[PDB]
Write a sequence for this structure.
């Protein structure tokens, strides 16, 4: 098992009065085992987070970005993020895929650009309730991953992280059973092994996301192909600390 | 007898500390003695640094976009989050969001309705593409874009509403719109408002020109009767933006 990752996706949430204490708790929590922590605040809150977050085990990521600077009102580019000293980015979140027209190809574009820019990337893949019921899970996630891999060189994979978040488990409280997560993660790593080798597939981090809580993190991490979590809701609470502890 | 003018700077997806700090210093060093409302709209990421250094009394900071509510919307920023941080000005419906991000008329109207309900000053963008203009649908298009937001707003809301006409037809083809071409549309827009919403509304409504503006043509444009200012693009990331503001004197 490679170094685990505990990522917090605050999504479209937060206020100064809410984030200050939360960041404080994060700064006092001293984890000893090897673990990479990542917090993803909104663009407007990256500045204050990067100013107060002092825990050396933590890194700050953006929740999204576009490939180049220019006439794109309202968007933020990888170049602007880089000049600010941010080197982690979440791309292809299902919410962006479903609501803001981010197609497999658009996502693959963003990931390729981010990798070249030197970013560490968390790419989200995942199937919907109807896609699973129709028995198309495997086809869906592999097609999503394949579009991304097609634009990457072998060396870029060292900066790539996979996040599997079944849409039917987002903000629904319906977490996948450990066996359910294991199965898909297993599928993902095997495809990567058969395609890029054992070395890369062995070092690759596949994170699980979707109604993760301190009450089920430990059990989910027990599985051999789960390398951590991408946490939403519970990431805005001191509970996140316990979830990081479950990656021991 | 034009209302108070507005000089807005849409920095779009551009910026860096090294570029922005000297720009803010320039704007802070400038003093405008006429009644003008200035606005700078930096990327979300740069809003904090701009709010901590911006001192010019005639300037307000605005957001380049926003969504109606907070929650599970990865990558976006909501009106409430912006409000809590002390931002009360927002740009919505920009042609770039309408063309690359599928923001329809209905989506833009809900965004404006909610921004008004939250106490924001709103700059709603409207404009037709080259295809639409060539097919002779300029009026049908802009008035439809405007009618969409109008239907969602109460009368009192319009006091915090500002309109920006975007000549997408000229922008997307590299052509330059003459002052008359601009005024032809501003006039139709004010006409519609004056006969649909009120004579009081039309007299106080600011309709900014969002085409290509520079210190060279800024004065010639503002001299037109129904143009109350500008929504500046690239020229707003340079010191010449000061001259564009002065052009509204
Ligand atoms: C910049 C990627 C978003 C795609 C919108 C259609
Ligand atoms: C480069 C960002 C524009 C979005 C195109 C879909
Ligand atoms: C094609 C001419 C444009 C004028 C619209 C009022």
């Amino acid at each position: 098992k490679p170094q685990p990752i505990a990522a917090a996706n605050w999504k479209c949430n937060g206020s100064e009065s809410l984030l200050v204490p939360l960041i404080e708790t994060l700064n006092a929590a001293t984890f000893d085992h090897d673990v990479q922590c990542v917090v993803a605040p909104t663009f407007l809150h990256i500045p204050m987070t990067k100013a107060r977050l002092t825990n050396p085990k933590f890194q700050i990521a953006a929740q999204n970005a576009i490939t180049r600077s220019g006439a794109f009102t309202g968007e933020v580019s990888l170049q602007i993020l880089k000049d600010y000293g941010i080197s982690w980015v979440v791309l292809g979140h299902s919410e962006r895929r479903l609501y803001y027209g981010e197609t497999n190809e658009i996502v693959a574009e963003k990931v390729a650009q981010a990798c070249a820019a030197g970013f560490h990337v968390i790419v989200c893949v995942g199937e919907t309730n109807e896609e699973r019921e129709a028995g198309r899970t495997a086809a869906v996630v592999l097609t999503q991953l394949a579009a991304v891999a097609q634009k990457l060189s072998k060396e870029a994979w060292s900066r790539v992280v996979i996040a599997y978040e079944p849409v039917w488990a987002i903000g629904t409280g319906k977490v996948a059973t450990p066996q359910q997560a294991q199965e898909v993660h297993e599928l993902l790593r095997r495809w990567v092994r058969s395609k890029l080798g054992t070395d890369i597939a062995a070092q690759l981090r596949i994170l699980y996301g979707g109604s993760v809580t301190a009450k089920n993190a430990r059990t989910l991490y027990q599985m051999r192909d789960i390398n951590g979590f991408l946490v939403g809701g519970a990431s805005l609470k001191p509970e996140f600390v316990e979830i990081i502890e479950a990656t021991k």
Remarks:
- Chain A touches chain B at residues 9, 11-16, 42-48, 63-64, 66, 69-77, 80-81, 83-84, 90, 93, 95-96, 99-101, 170-171, 232 (CB under 8 Å).
- Residues 1-248 of chain A form a domain with the TIM Barrel fold (CATH 3.20.20.70).
